[PDB]
């Protein structure tokens, strides 16, 4: 849920002193946005335009207007934006944090629950595909959990080990290239947040994939889920499924299991 306008009132926003995470953009802080009867916990991305870039404002506003229309629940949605002491991108909070670190710390999560989470990710990706948006950086670190039963895709475009051969070779990014990344993501998920291609460098992964070699079936991963991973890793981009086909397969599978 979003208020009518994209611009939020800075006086209605409270930020935590502690930062959730930093980087070469700014930082992400936990916040609280005051609405009529309730208070909504939010994750606020803060952009200090340190080099006073005149181009930033236009870029951010064009993005916010696109974000205001992206309503699917399987994505981290924008609450709004505010031009205060810094630009603040007020997003939904996904309390449990990244999928990979979550699974790592919670080895008790069942295969059924992992299947549910990966199906929600394919629902979010199907939605982005339908909207002509390519993620470019789809990975388990980029799936944030609101609950153990509610996953949201973050930081979509608007990681060589997650790249489709045509990304590394011909610099071709598409939703089908994101399907390859979704295959790696499914591997990370069923592997409980373990690192893909452990100890390998990006050049070695390429050489491995050209041999027709793929990562093996994770311990306890259902066979049909490993088969779907492997289909996401179809070398030829023309025979690799899109997200509508992947989501429908996960959808049928989930409602039987
Ligand atoms: C528990 O720990 C965490 C929970 C979190 N819960 C939700 C969001 C978080 O951070 C994010 C992730 C992505 C984006 N942003 C995005 O996903 C994003 C997607 C697309 C476009 N734009 C630009 C834009 C947004 C809004 C307006 C204008 C431009 C985006 O920022 N912003 C903040 C969290 C971070 C955490 O720790 C580090």
Short mmCIF file of N, CA, C and O in Angstrom, two decimals, residues 59-195:
data_model
loop_
_atom_site.label_atom_id
_atom_site.label_comp_id
_atom_site.label_asym_id
_atom_site.label_seq_id
_atom_site.Cartn_x
_atom_site.Cartn_y
_atom_site.Cartn_z
N UNK A 59 16.64 11.54 -13.11
CA UNK A 59 16.72 10.08 -13.15
C UNK A 59 15.83 9.47 -12.08
O UNK A 59 15.02 8.60 -12.40
N UNK A 60 15.96 9.94 -10.82
CA UNK A 60 15.18 9.45 -9.66
C UNK A 60 13.69 9.65 -9.83
O UNK A 60 12.91 8.77 -9.46
N UNK A 61 13.29 10.81 -10.37
CA UNK A 61 11.87 11.14 -10.54
C UNK A 61 11.21 10.31 -11.63
O UNK A 61 10.06 9.94 -11.50
N UNK A 62 11.94 10.02 -12.69
CA UNK A 62 11.46 9.19 -13.79
C UNK A 62 11.27 7.77 -13.24
O UNK A 62 10.22 7.17 -13.46
N UNK A 63 12.24 7.30 -12.43
CA UNK A 63 12.17 5.98 -11.81
C UNK A 63 11.00 5.87 -10.86
O UNK A 63 10.28 4.89 -10.93
N UNK A 64 10.81 6.88 -9.98
CA UNK A 64 9.71 6.91 -8.98
C UNK A 64 8.35 6.83 -9.65
O UNK A 64 7.45 6.15 -9.15
N UNK A 65 8.19 7.51 -10.80
CA UNK A 65 6.94 7.47 -11.56
C UNK A 65 6.67 6.08 -12.15
O UNK A 65 5.52 5.65 -12.20
N UNK A 66 7.72 5.35 -12.50
CA UNK A 66 7.60 3.96 -12.96
C UNK A 66 7.26 3.01 -11.77
O UNK A 66 6.34 2.19 -11.86
N UNK A 67 7.96 3.21 -10.63
CA UNK A 67 7.82 2.47 -9.38
C UNK A 67 6.43 2.57 -8.79
O UNK A 67 5.95 1.60 -8.19
N UNK A 68 5.78 3.73 -8.95
CA UNK A 68 4.43 3.99 -8.46
C UNK A 68 3.38 3.05 -9.08
O UNK A 68 2.34 2.79 -8.47
N UNK A 69 3.70 2.50 -10.27
CA UNK A 69 2.86 1.58 -11.04
C UNK A 69 3.20 0.09 -10.80
O UNK A 69 2.46 -0.78 -11.27
N UNK A 70 4.32 -0.21 -10.10
CA UNK A 70 4.73 -1.61 -9.89
C UNK A 70 4.19 -2.11 -8.58
O UNK A 70 4.77 -1.83 -7.52
N UNK A 71 3.04 -2.80 -8.65
CA UNK A 71 2.24 -3.24 -7.51
C UNK A 71 2.26 -4.71 -7.15
O UNK A 71 1.61 -5.08 -6.15
N UNK A 72 2.96 -5.55 -7.92
CA UNK A 72 3.02 -6.98 -7.62
C UNK A 72 3.59 -7.22 -6.19
O UNK A 72 4.58 -6.58 -5.85
N UNK A 73 3.00 -8.11 -5.36
CA UNK A 73 3.57 -8.33 -4.01
C UNK A 73 4.93 -9.03 -3.95
O UNK A 73 5.56 -9.00 -2.89
N UNK A 74 5.40 -9.66 -5.05
CA UNK A 74 6.67 -10.42 -5.03
C UNK A 74 7.91 -9.64 -5.42
O UNK A 74 8.94 -10.19 -5.78
N UNK A 75 7.83 -8.33 -5.19
CA UNK A 75 8.83 -7.31 -5.44
C UNK A 75 8.83 -6.37 -4.22
O UNK A 75 7.84 -6.28 -3.51
N UNK A 76 9.97 -5.72 -3.96
CA UNK A 76 10.11 -4.75 -2.90
C UNK A 76 9.50 -3.53 -3.52
O UNK A 76 10.00 -3.06 -4.54
N UNK A 77 8.38 -3.07 -2.98
CA UNK A 77 7.72 -1.94 -3.65
C UNK A 77 8.08 -0.62 -3.02
O UNK A 77 8.50 -0.59 -1.88
N UNK A 78 7.96 0.46 -3.81
CA UNK A 78 8.20 1.81 -3.35
C UNK A 78 6.99 2.32 -2.57
O UNK A 78 5.85 2.18 -3.02
N UNK A 79 7.21 2.89 -1.37
CA UNK A 79 6.14 3.56 -0.62
C UNK A 79 6.04 5.00 -1.15
O UNK A 79 4.95 5.53 -1.40
N UNK A 80 7.21 5.60 -1.34
CA UNK A 80 7.34 6.94 -1.86
C UNK A 80 8.78 7.40 -1.78
O UNK A 80 9.70 6.62 -1.50
N UNK A 81 8.97 8.69 -2.04
CA UNK A 81 10.26 9.36 -2.09
C UNK A 81 10.15 10.68 -1.35
O UNK A 81 9.09 11.30 -1.31
N UNK A 82 11.23 11.11 -0.73
CA UNK A 82 11.29 12.47 -0.24
C UNK A 82 12.61 13.19 -0.38
O UNK A 82 13.67 12.57 -0.32
N UNK A 83 12.51 14.43 -0.83
CA UNK A 83 13.64 15.32 -1.05
C UNK A 83 13.83 16.07 0.25
O UNK A 83 13.17 17.08 0.50
N UNK A 84 14.69 15.51 1.11
CA UNK A 84 14.99 16.10 2.41
C UNK A 84 16.49 16.39 2.48
O UNK A 84 17.06 16.79 1.46
N UNK A 85 17.14 16.16 3.64
CA UNK A 85 18.59 16.37 3.84
C UNK A 85 19.43 15.56 2.85
O UNK A 85 20.61 15.83 2.63
N UNK A 86 18.78 14.56 2.27
CA UNK A 86 19.26 13.67 1.24
C UNK A 86 18.02 13.14 0.56
O UNK A 86 16.92 13.33 1.07
N UNK A 87 18.18 12.50 -0.59
CA UNK A 87 17.09 11.85 -1.27
C UNK A 87 16.88 10.57 -0.50
O UNK A 87 17.85 9.92 -0.14
N UNK A 88 15.62 10.25 -0.18
CA UNK A 88 15.25 9.06 0.56
C UNK A 88 14.18 8.33 -0.21
O UNK A 88 13.12 8.89 -0.45
N UNK A 89 14.49 7.09 -0.60
CA UNK A 89 13.65 6.16 -1.34
C UNK A 89 13.04 5.24 -0.27
O UNK A 89 13.73 4.40 0.32
N UNK A 90 11.78 5.48 0.03
CA UNK A 90 11.09 4.76 1.09
C UNK A 90 10.47 3.50 0.50
O UNK A 90 9.55 3.56 -0.32
N UNK A 91 11.04 2.37 0.86
CA UNK A 91 10.59 1.08 0.36
C UNK A 91 9.97 0.26 1.48
O UNK A 91 10.22 0.53 2.66
N UNK A 92 9.24 -0.80 1.09
CA UNK A 92 8.70 -1.80 2.02
C UNK A 92 9.85 -2.45 2.74
O UNK A 92 10.90 -2.65 2.14
N UNK A 93 9.64 -2.80 4.02
CA UNK A 93 10.63 -3.52 4.82
C UNK A 93 10.46 -5.03 4.63
O UNK A 93 9.36 -5.53 4.78
N UNK A 94 11.55 -5.77 4.40
CA UNK A 94 11.52 -7.22 4.32
C UNK A 94 12.39 -7.65 5.49
O UNK A 94 13.60 -7.86 5.37
N UNK A 95 11.74 -7.62 6.67
CA UNK A 95 12.31 -7.85 8.00
C UNK A 95 13.36 -8.97 8.09
O UNK A 95 14.45 -8.75 8.65
N UNK A 96 13.08 -10.14 7.51
CA UNK A 96 14.01 -11.28 7.62
C UNK A 96 15.31 -11.17 6.81
O UNK A 96 16.24 -11.91 7.05
N UNK A 97 15.37 -10.21 5.88
CA UNK A 97 16.56 -9.96 5.08
C UNK A 97 16.82 -10.95 3.95
O UNK A 97 15.91 -11.68 3.56
N UNK A 98 18.06 -10.99 3.41
CA UNK A 98 18.36 -11.87 2.26
C UNK A 98 18.15 -13.37 2.45
O UNK A 98 18.57 -13.96 3.43
N UNK A 99 17.58 -13.99 1.41
CA UNK A 99 17.28 -15.42 1.33
C UNK A 99 18.48 -16.28 1.63
O UNK A 99 18.36 -17.24 2.40
N UNK A 100 19.62 -15.96 1.03
CA UNK A 100 20.81 -16.77 1.23
C UNK A 100 21.26 -16.82 2.70
O UNK A 100 21.57 -17.90 3.21
N UNK A 101 21.29 -15.66 3.38
CA UNK A 101 21.71 -15.60 4.77
C UNK A 101 20.63 -16.16 5.65
O UNK A 101 20.93 -16.79 6.67
N UNK A 102 19.35 -15.99 5.23
CA UNK A 102 18.27 -16.58 6.02
C UNK A 102 18.36 -18.11 6.05
O UNK A 102 18.37 -18.70 7.12
N UNK A 103 18.43 -18.74 4.87
CA UNK A 103 18.54 -20.20 4.77
C UNK A 103 19.76 -20.72 5.49
O UNK A 103 19.67 -21.72 6.21
N UNK A 104 20.88 -20.01 5.38
CA UNK A 104 22.12 -20.36 6.07
C UNK A 104 21.87 -20.47 7.59
O UNK A 104 22.22 -21.48 8.21
N UNK A 105 21.21 -19.46 8.17
CA UNK A 105 20.94 -19.45 9.61
C UNK A 105 19.75 -20.30 10.04
O UNK A 105 19.54 -20.50 11.24
N UNK A 106 18.95 -20.77 9.09
CA UNK A 106 17.75 -21.52 9.41
C UNK A 106 17.71 -22.76 8.58
O UNK A 106 16.89 -22.89 7.68
N UNK A 107 18.56 -23.73 8.93
CA UNK A 107 18.63 -24.99 8.20
C UNK A 107 17.37 -25.89 8.32
O UNK A 107 17.23 -26.82 7.53
N UNK A 108 16.43 -25.55 9.25
CA UNK A 108 15.17 -26.27 9.51
C UNK A 108 14.08 -26.03 8.47
O UNK A 108 13.07 -26.74 8.48
N UNK A 109 14.27 -25.01 7.58
CA UNK A 109 13.31 -24.72 6.51
C UNK A 109 13.14 -26.00 5.64
O UNK A 109 14.12 -26.64 5.28
N UNK A 110 11.90 -26.40 5.40
CA UNK A 110 11.58 -27.61 4.64
C UNK A 110 11.60 -27.36 3.13
O UNK A 110 11.44 -26.22 2.69
N UNK A 111 11.80 -28.44 2.34
CA UNK A 111 11.85 -28.42 0.88
C UNK A 111 10.61 -27.74 0.32
O UNK A 111 10.73 -26.88 -0.56
N UNK A 112 9.42 -28.06 0.90
CA UNK A 112 8.09 -27.53 0.58
C UNK A 112 8.08 -26.01 0.69
O UNK A 112 7.57 -25.32 -0.19
N UNK A 113 8.65 -25.50 1.78
CA UNK A 113 8.80 -24.07 2.06
C UNK A 113 9.77 -23.43 1.04
O UNK A 113 9.51 -22.32 0.60
N UNK A 114 10.86 -24.12 0.67
CA UNK A 114 11.79 -23.59 -0.35
C UNK A 114 11.09 -23.50 -1.71
O UNK A 114 11.24 -22.50 -2.41
N UNK A 115 10.26 -24.52 -2.05
CA UNK A 115 9.49 -24.58 -3.29
C UNK A 115 8.53 -23.39 -3.35
O UNK A 115 8.40 -22.75 -4.39
N UNK A 116 7.87 -23.09 -2.21
CA UNK A 116 6.94 -21.96 -2.07
C UNK A 116 7.66 -20.64 -2.34
O UNK A 116 7.15 -19.81 -3.07
N UNK A 117 8.81 -20.44 -1.71
CA UNK A 117 9.62 -19.24 -1.87
C UNK A 117 10.11 -19.04 -3.29
O UNK A 117 10.06 -17.91 -3.78
N UNK A 118 10.62 -20.10 -3.94
CA UNK A 118 11.11 -19.99 -5.32
C UNK A 118 9.97 -19.73 -6.31
O UNK A 118 10.17 -19.02 -7.28
N UNK A 119 8.74 -20.28 -6.04
CA UNK A 119 7.56 -20.01 -6.87
C UNK A 119 7.15 -18.52 -6.78
O UNK A 119 6.82 -17.91 -7.80
N UNK A 120 7.22 -17.92 -5.58
CA UNK A 120 6.91 -16.49 -5.39
C UNK A 120 7.91 -15.66 -6.19
O UNK A 120 7.50 -14.73 -6.86
N UNK A 121 9.22 -16.03 -6.16
CA UNK A 121 10.25 -15.35 -6.93
C UNK A 121 9.91 -15.43 -8.44
O UNK A 121 9.95 -14.40 -9.12
N UNK A 122 9.48 -16.60 -8.93
CA UNK A 122 9.12 -16.75 -10.35
C UNK A 122 7.85 -15.92 -10.66
O UNK A 122 7.74 -15.39 -11.75
N UNK A 123 6.92 -15.76 -9.68
CA UNK A 123 5.74 -14.90 -9.85
C UNK A 123 6.20 -13.43 -10.00
O UNK A 123 5.76 -12.76 -10.94
N UNK A 124 7.13 -12.98 -9.15
CA UNK A 124 7.67 -11.63 -9.23
C UNK A 124 8.44 -11.39 -10.52
O UNK A 124 8.38 -10.31 -11.10
N UNK A 125 9.19 -12.40 -10.98
CA UNK A 125 9.98 -12.29 -12.21
C UNK A 125 9.08 -12.31 -13.45
O UNK A 125 9.34 -11.60 -14.42
N UNK A 126 8.02 -13.14 -13.42
CA UNK A 126 6.99 -13.20 -14.48
C UNK A 126 6.38 -11.80 -14.62
O UNK A 126 6.26 -11.29 -15.73
N UNK A 127 6.02 -11.17 -13.48
CA UNK A 127 5.49 -9.82 -13.48
C UNK A 127 6.47 -8.82 -14.10
O UNK A 127 6.05 -8.03 -14.95
N UNK A 128 7.77 -8.84 -13.71
CA UNK A 128 8.79 -7.93 -14.26
C UNK A 128 8.99 -8.18 -15.75
O UNK A 128 9.12 -7.22 -16.51
N UNK A 129 8.98 -9.46 -16.17
CA UNK A 129 9.10 -9.87 -17.57
C UNK A 129 7.95 -9.26 -18.37
O UNK A 129 8.19 -8.72 -19.43
N UNK A 130 6.71 -9.36 -17.85
CA UNK A 130 5.48 -8.84 -18.48
C UNK A 130 5.55 -7.34 -18.67
O UNK A 130 4.86 -6.81 -19.54
N UNK A 131 6.34 -6.65 -17.84
CA UNK A 131 6.48 -5.20 -17.79
C UNK A 131 7.70 -4.77 -18.56
O UNK A 131 8.06 -3.60 -18.50
N UNK A 132 8.35 -5.72 -19.25
CA UNK A 132 9.56 -5.48 -20.04
C UNK A 132 10.75 -4.97 -19.21
O UNK A 132 11.53 -4.16 -19.69
N UNK A 133 10.87 -5.46 -17.95
CA UNK A 133 11.97 -5.11 -17.07
C UNK A 133 12.87 -6.29 -16.84
O UNK A 133 12.41 -7.36 -16.46
N UNK A 134 14.16 -6.12 -17.11
CA UNK A 134 15.13 -7.17 -16.90
C UNK A 134 15.88 -6.87 -15.62
O UNK A 134 16.23 -5.71 -15.37
N UNK A 135 15.98 -7.86 -14.73
CA UNK A 135 16.60 -7.63 -13.45
C UNK A 135 18.08 -7.31 -13.63
O UNK A 135 18.51 -6.22 -13.22
N UNK A 136 18.84 -8.25 -14.25
CA UNK A 136 20.29 -8.19 -14.50
C UNK A 136 21.11 -8.70 -13.33
O UNK A 136 22.22 -9.17 -13.54
N UNK A 137 20.56 -8.64 -12.10
CA UNK A 137 21.31 -9.10 -10.92
C UNK A 137 20.49 -10.02 -10.01
O UNK A 137 20.58 -9.94 -8.79
N UNK A 138 19.70 -10.91 -10.62
CA UNK A 138 18.87 -11.84 -9.86
C UNK A 138 19.73 -12.87 -9.18
O UNK A 138 20.54 -13.53 -9.82
N UNK A 139 19.62 -12.96 -7.85
CA UNK A 139 20.41 -13.89 -7.03
C UNK A 139 19.70 -14.04 -5.70
O UNK A 139 18.89 -13.17 -5.36
N UNK A 140 20.02 -15.09 -4.93
CA UNK A 140 19.41 -15.27 -3.61
C UNK A 140 19.69 -14.08 -2.64
O UNK A 140 18.80 -13.71 -1.87
N UNK A 141 20.87 -13.40 -2.75
CA UNK A 141 21.18 -12.21 -1.92
C UNK A 141 20.21 -11.07 -2.25
O UNK A 141 20.04 -10.16 -1.45
N UNK A 142 19.57 -11.13 -3.45
CA UNK A 142 18.64 -10.13 -3.96
C UNK A 142 17.17 -10.49 -3.80
O UNK A 142 16.30 -9.85 -4.40
N UNK A 143 16.89 -11.49 -2.97
CA UNK A 143 15.54 -11.92 -2.61
C UNK A 143 15.53 -11.67 -1.11
O UNK A 143 16.41 -12.15 -0.40
N UNK A 144 14.58 -10.83 -0.66
CA UNK A 144 14.46 -10.44 0.74
C UNK A 144 13.18 -11.03 1.32
O UNK A 144 12.15 -11.03 0.66
N UNK A 145 13.24 -11.51 2.54
CA UNK A 145 12.08 -12.12 3.15
C UNK A 145 11.32 -11.20 4.11
O UNK A 145 11.91 -10.67 5.04
N UNK A 146 10.01 -11.06 3.92
CA UNK A 146 9.13 -10.31 4.82
C UNK A 146 8.82 -11.31 5.97
O UNK A 146 8.88 -10.94 7.13
N UNK A 147 8.53 -12.58 5.60
CA UNK A 147 8.28 -13.75 6.49
C UNK A 147 8.93 -14.98 5.82
O UNK A 147 9.25 -14.93 4.62
N UNK A 148 9.05 -16.09 6.56
CA UNK A 148 9.58 -17.35 6.05
C UNK A 148 8.69 -17.83 4.90
O UNK A 148 9.13 -18.69 4.14
N UNK A 149 7.46 -17.30 4.78
CA UNK A 149 6.51 -17.68 3.73
C UNK A 149 6.15 -16.53 2.77
O UNK A 149 5.12 -16.59 2.11
N UNK A 150 7.02 -15.51 2.68
CA UNK A 150 6.78 -14.32 1.84
C UNK A 150 8.11 -13.72 1.42
O UNK A 150 8.80 -13.09 2.22
N UNK A 151 8.49 -13.96 0.16
CA UNK A 151 9.70 -13.45 -0.48
C UNK A 151 9.38 -12.29 -1.45
O UNK A 151 8.37 -12.35 -2.18
N UNK A 152 10.28 -11.30 -1.49
CA UNK A 152 10.24 -10.14 -2.39
C UNK A 152 11.55 -9.96 -3.14
O UNK A 152 12.61 -9.98 -2.53
N UNK A 153 11.48 -9.72 -4.45
CA UNK A 153 12.68 -9.47 -5.27
C UNK A 153 13.12 -8.00 -5.10
O UNK A 153 12.31 -7.09 -5.30
N UNK A 154 14.41 -7.77 -4.78
CA UNK A 154 14.93 -6.42 -4.65
C UNK A 154 15.97 -6.10 -5.71
O UNK A 154 16.52 -7.01 -6.35
N UNK A 155 16.26 -4.79 -5.84
CA UNK A 155 17.29 -4.21 -6.69
C UNK A 155 17.24 -4.60 -8.15
O UNK A 155 18.29 -4.81 -8.75
N UNK A 156 16.04 -4.67 -8.72
CA UNK A 156 15.89 -4.99 -10.13
C UNK A 156 16.34 -3.76 -10.95
O UNK A 156 16.14 -2.63 -10.50
N UNK A 157 16.93 -4.03 -12.12
CA UNK A 157 17.52 -3.08 -13.06
C UNK A 157 16.80 -1.78 -13.38
O UNK A 157 17.40 -0.72 -13.26
N UNK A 158 15.52 -1.86 -13.82
CA UNK A 158 14.68 -0.70 -14.18
C UNK A 158 15.14 0.06 -15.44
O UNK A 158 15.94 1.00 -15.38
N UNK A 159 28.31 -10.20 -11.44
CA UNK A 159 27.74 -11.44 -10.91
C UNK A 159 27.85 -12.57 -11.94
O UNK A 159 26.86 -13.24 -12.25
N UNK A 160 29.07 -12.76 -12.46
CA UNK A 160 29.43 -13.73 -13.51
C UNK A 160 28.87 -15.14 -13.29
O UNK A 160 28.40 -15.75 -14.24
N UNK A 161 28.88 -15.62 -12.05
CA UNK A 161 28.38 -16.94 -11.68
C UNK A 161 26.85 -17.06 -11.85
O UNK A 161 26.34 -18.18 -11.93
N UNK A 162 26.12 -15.91 -11.99
CA UNK A 162 24.66 -15.86 -12.23
C UNK A 162 24.34 -15.51 -13.69
O UNK A 162 23.17 -15.49 -14.07
N UNK A 163 25.35 -15.23 -14.50
CA UNK A 163 25.15 -14.82 -15.90
C UNK A 163 24.96 -15.94 -16.85
O UNK A 163 25.67 -16.95 -16.80
N UNK A 164 24.07 -15.71 -17.83
CA UNK A 164 23.82 -16.66 -18.91
C UNK A 164 25.01 -16.57 -19.87
O UNK A 164 25.60 -15.49 -19.99
N UNK A 165 25.41 -17.66 -20.56
CA UNK A 165 26.56 -17.58 -21.49
C UNK A 165 26.53 -16.38 -22.45
O UNK A 165 27.55 -15.72 -22.60
N UNK A 166 25.35 -16.03 -23.02
CA UNK A 166 25.20 -14.87 -23.91
C UNK A 166 25.42 -13.50 -23.26
O UNK A 166 25.57 -12.53 -24.00
N UNK A 167 25.44 -13.42 -21.91
CA UNK A 167 25.75 -12.16 -21.19
C UNK A 167 27.27 -11.95 -21.20
O UNK A 167 27.72 -10.83 -21.42
N UNK A 168 28.04 -13.00 -20.86
CA UNK A 168 29.50 -12.99 -20.78
C UNK A 168 30.09 -12.90 -22.18
O UNK A 168 31.08 -12.19 -22.39
N UNK A 169 29.46 -13.59 -23.15
CA UNK A 169 29.95 -13.62 -24.53
C UNK A 169 29.53 -12.45 -25.43
O UNK A 169 30.40 -11.79 -26.00
N UNK A 170 28.22 -12.23 -25.58
CA UNK A 170 27.66 -11.25 -26.51
C UNK A 170 27.00 -10.02 -25.88
O UNK A 170 26.40 -9.20 -26.60
N UNK A 171 27.15 -9.87 -24.53
CA UNK A 171 26.65 -8.76 -23.70
C UNK A 171 25.13 -8.56 -23.83
O UNK A 171 24.63 -7.44 -23.69
N UNK A 172 24.42 -9.68 -24.08
CA UNK A 172 22.97 -9.73 -24.28
C UNK A 172 22.19 -10.05 -23.00
O UNK A 172 22.15 -11.19 -22.54
N UNK A 173 21.53 -9.02 -22.45
CA UNK A 173 20.68 -9.11 -21.27
C UNK A 173 19.21 -9.10 -21.65
O UNK A 173 18.78 -8.24 -22.41
N UNK A 174 18.45 -10.08 -21.15
CA UNK A 174 17.02 -10.25 -21.42
C UNK A 174 16.36 -10.99 -20.25
O UNK A 174 17.05 -11.50 -19.39
N UNK A 175 15.04 -11.17 -20.29
CA UNK A 175 14.31 -11.93 -19.27
C UNK A 175 14.77 -13.41 -19.25
O UNK A 175 14.74 -14.03 -18.19
N UNK A 176 15.17 -13.95 -20.42
CA UNK A 176 15.69 -15.31 -20.59
C UNK A 176 17.07 -15.46 -19.93
O UNK A 176 17.40 -16.53 -19.44
N UNK A 177 17.85 -14.38 -19.91
CA UNK A 177 19.15 -14.25 -19.24
C UNK A 177 18.85 -14.26 -17.71
O UNK A 177 19.53 -14.93 -16.94
N UNK A 178 17.75 -13.61 -17.28
CA UNK A 178 17.30 -13.62 -15.87
C UNK A 178 16.83 -15.02 -15.45
O UNK A 178 16.99 -15.38 -14.28
N UNK A 179 16.24 -15.81 -16.39
CA UNK A 179 15.83 -17.20 -16.14
C UNK A 179 17.07 -18.04 -15.79
O UNK A 179 17.04 -18.80 -14.82
N UNK A 180 18.19 -17.85 -16.51
CA UNK A 180 19.43 -18.56 -16.18
C UNK A 180 19.80 -18.22 -14.69
O UNK A 180 20.06 -19.14 -13.90
N UNK A 181 19.79 -16.91 -14.31
CA UNK A 181 20.07 -16.42 -12.94
C UNK A 181 19.11 -17.03 -11.94
O UNK A 181 19.52 -17.36 -10.83
N UNK A 182 17.83 -17.20 -12.34
CA UNK A 182 16.80 -17.85 -11.52
C UNK A 182 17.15 -19.33 -11.24
O UNK A 182 16.81 -19.85 -10.17
N UNK A 183 17.80 -19.98 -12.20
CA UNK A 183 18.26 -21.36 -12.06
C UNK A 183 19.34 -21.43 -11.00
O UNK A 183 19.32 -22.33 -10.15
N UNK A 184 20.27 -20.44 -11.00
CA UNK A 184 21.36 -20.39 -10.01
C UNK A 184 20.72 -20.11 -8.65
O UNK A 184 21.02 -20.79 -7.70
N UNK A 185 19.77 -19.17 -8.61
CA UNK A 185 19.02 -18.79 -7.42
C UNK A 185 18.34 -20.04 -6.78
O UNK A 185 18.43 -20.23 -5.57
N UNK A 186 17.62 -20.86 -7.60
CA UNK A 186 16.98 -22.12 -7.16
C UNK A 186 18.07 -23.03 -6.59
O UNK A 186 17.85 -23.67 -5.55
N UNK A 187 19.25 -23.09 -7.24
CA UNK A 187 20.34 -23.93 -6.70
C UNK A 187 20.77 -23.44 -5.31
O UNK A 187 20.94 -24.26 -4.42
N UNK A 188 20.95 -22.11 -5.14
CA UNK A 188 21.35 -21.48 -3.86
C UNK A 188 20.30 -21.79 -2.82
O UNK A 188 20.66 -22.17 -1.72
N UNK A 189 19.00 -21.60 -3.16
CA UNK A 189 17.88 -21.87 -2.26
C UNK A 189 17.91 -23.34 -1.76
O UNK A 189 17.99 -23.58 -0.55
N UNK A 190 17.86 -24.31 -2.67
CA UNK A 190 17.88 -25.73 -2.25
C UNK A 190 19.18 -26.15 -1.59
O UNK A 190 19.23 -27.19 -0.91
N UNK A 191 20.23 -25.31 -1.74
CA UNK A 191 21.52 -25.51 -1.09
C UNK A 191 21.61 -24.72 0.20
O UNK A 191 22.69 -24.64 0.77
N UNK A 192 20.50 -24.10 0.65
CA UNK A 192 20.50 -23.37 1.91
C UNK A 192 21.50 -22.20 1.98
O UNK A 192 22.12 -21.97 3.00
N UNK A 193 21.62 -21.45 0.88
CA UNK A 193 22.49 -20.28 0.83
C UNK A 193 23.96 -20.57 0.63
O UNK A 193 24.80 -19.69 0.83
N UNK A 194 24.31 -21.80 0.21
CA UNK A 194 25.70 -22.12 -0.10
C UNK A 194 26.08 -21.39 -1.39
O UNK A 194 25.21 -21.06 -2.22
N UNK A 195 27.39 -21.10 -1.54
CA UNK A 195 27.97 -20.37 -2.65
C UNK A 195 27.96 -21.22 -3.94
O UNK A 195 28.47 -22.34 -3.92
#
